[PDB]
């Protein structure tokens, strides 16, 4: 159990910066040509 | 079979249909059986890789949300593309790229 | 391209109805029913 | 969610605070006697 | 480096005739003459850019064997811009055209020289009459016109 | 009233998706109300559903 | 992709394809796609077809009929998608648009545009004319 524990919590991510700048032009399309606009929104998952 | 699939002038106006039916997902497991071997020596059954795989990539050219949905087993497609090498017409890293 | 974007009233029917399935999901998805969470381990569990 | 469910605004008073960790308390009693936590 | 490149551009009617296999060599044609249509930066004290405008017309004079409707639109506007940038000094591409492109007048293949002729007078209303033979010609183009 | 013309913008723009989103929206919501429809179709739903 | 095309335009292409296919199986020969195009009113010199085999063995299937169908269509109407994309800033239609009418309608287009970004995009480009429009857009 207790290598679980250990090993699990060294896999949780942080921080990090270089894929912040994805998301900082990423953001900067509004709509597929014509498709239901970006479907993901948010799409929050890549920082935390 | 798969010839015949590519006929029926459904499998170009509702894609919606097969992401539902989700066959890109079955035939996946098709190739993947054929080409678990050792090394290069198990490269049983060839012929159908190549009869296959050119399904996939005009799969891929149809609409962007079916780009999306097969793009992310880019990781599992990767893992045992560069190991069978040496035949023409297609083979899975032509689909990965 | 916004301005060639096609009304809503050129849809073939069979199309403009798969649109509003998948868009009315804005009824179920915000509804709570609750019920089955107090009730489960009442009947359930206690009183077996 | 059977458990947390009782888990700008008046001064709680003594007698009701106990009420809820007494309920809360109860609620889960119920779930660790029946085998459950040790899994 | 057109000391180099107009070598393998020397070779450019040398099969657009008979038949011509591999026509691979149009395919260099589409990251070099663009590259070269990019560059208004020319000046004297040479004259091989005269064996190398007419190489260019010399591309030009297929008017449908083996040039792609699409891909005869680079070599088209690899010349059309090319003009402005020379000193005056287009002597024999002039004399090139002089009544042949007069001639057919009735042909497709016109309007490659017709709008680039009038880009010529267009910017020398008022000058390029420094010459003899050549004023000769214009007139001899303009009779037959 | 010109503004008018203004308001009058998912009917022309906006992918079709975008248009079901604004029509459906007060449908089947609870109490506000934004660009409703006839208070004749509005009825089925509150009994459909 | 493929997606630009309607249902209509594809069941007329399979329509086409299916009445000059040798047994079904999907082929052709190098002249049969020459007179599966002429038999729609659309009449391509050889140097159209000329690229597309050497694009795409004298085996032409159905999705590489398909896909020449696509580009052939789409590069035309790509050409003229701007123009009728034009015909609702201007009222009369000849490419004249007011500039006081331009900044309450573009900004509810429906692409999250703010006052910003269609005040960047009119002061880098009264009434201005159609050509104009496709010279700032493209750029």
């Known amino acids: 159990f207790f290598q679980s524990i250990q090993a699990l919590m060294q896999t949780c991510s942080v921080l990090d910066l270089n894929a912040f700048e994805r998301q900082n032009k990423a953001e900067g399309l509004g709509m597929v040509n014509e498709d239901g606009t970006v479907i993901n929104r948010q799409n929050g998952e890549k920082v935390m | ?97 | 391209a916004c301005f060639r974007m096609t009304p809503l009233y050129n849809l073939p029917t069979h199309r403009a109805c798969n649109m509003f399935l998948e868009s009315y999901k804005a009824a179920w998805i915000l509804t709570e029913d609750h019920s089955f969470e107090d009730r489960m381990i009442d009947d359930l569990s206690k009183a077996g | 969610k059977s458990c947390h469910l009782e888990e700008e605004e008046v001064e709680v008073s003594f007698e009701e605070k106990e009420m809820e960790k007494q309920r809360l308390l109860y609620q889960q009693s119920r779930l660790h006697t029946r085998g459950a936590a040790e899994m | 480096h057109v000391l180099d490149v107009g070598f393998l551009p020397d070779m450019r009617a040398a099969a657009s005739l008979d038949t011509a296999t591999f026509s691979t060599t149009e395919m260099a044609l589409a990251l070099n003459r663009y590259l070269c249509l990019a560059v208004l930066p020319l000046i004297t004290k040479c004259a091989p850019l005269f064996a190398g405008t007419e190489h260019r017309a010399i591309m030009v004079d297929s008017m449908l064997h083996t040039v792609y409707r699409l891909s005869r639109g680079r070599s088209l506007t690899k010349a059309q811009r090319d003009v402005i940038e020379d000193c005056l000094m287009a002597l024999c591409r002039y004399i090139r055209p002089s009544m042949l492109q007069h001639l057919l007048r009735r042909l497709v293949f016109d309007v490659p020289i017709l709008n680039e002729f009038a880009k010529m007078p267009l910017k020398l209303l008022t000058n390029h009459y420094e010459r003899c033979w050549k004023y000769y010609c214009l007139p001899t183009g303009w009779a037959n016109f | 009233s010109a503004a008018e013309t203004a308001r009058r913008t998912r009917e022309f723009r906006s992918p079709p998706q975008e248009q079901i989103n604004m029509l459906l929206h007060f449908k089947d919501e609870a109490d506000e109300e934004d660009c409703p429809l006839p208070e004749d179709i509005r009825q089925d739903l509150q009994d459909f559903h | 992709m493929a997606d630009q095309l309607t249902e209509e335009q594809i069941a007329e292409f399979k329509e086409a394809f299916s009445l000059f296919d040798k047994d079904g199986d999907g082929t052709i020969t190098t002249k049969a796609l020459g007179t599966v195009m002429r038999s729609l009113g659309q009449n391509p010199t050889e140097a159209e077809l000329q690229d597309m085999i050497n694009e795409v063995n004298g085996t032409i299937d159905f999705p590489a009929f398909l896909t020449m169908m696509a580009r052939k269509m789409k590069d035309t109407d790509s050409e003229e998608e701007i123009r009728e994309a034009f015909r609702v800033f201007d009222k009369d239609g000849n490419g004249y648009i007011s500039a006081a009418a331009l900044r309450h309608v573009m900004t509810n287009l429906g692409e999250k545009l703010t006052d910003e970004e269609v005040d960047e995009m009119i002061r880098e480009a009264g009434q201005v004319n159609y050509e104009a429009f496709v010279q700032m857009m493209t750029a």
């Open chain 2, 1 to 97: 079979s798969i010839g015949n699939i590519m006929n029926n002038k459904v499998f170009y106006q509702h894609p919606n249909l097969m992401r539902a039916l989700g066959m890109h997902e079955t035939v996946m497991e098709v190739m993947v059986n054929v080409l678990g071997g050792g090394e290069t020596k198990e490269i049983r059954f060839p012929k159908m890789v190549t009869s296959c795989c050119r399904f996939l990539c005009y799969f891929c050219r149809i609409s962007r949300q079916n780009q999306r949905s097969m793009f992310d087993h880019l990781s599992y497609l990767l893992e045992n593309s560069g190991i069978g090498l040496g035949m023409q017409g297609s083979t899975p890293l032509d689909v990965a790229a």
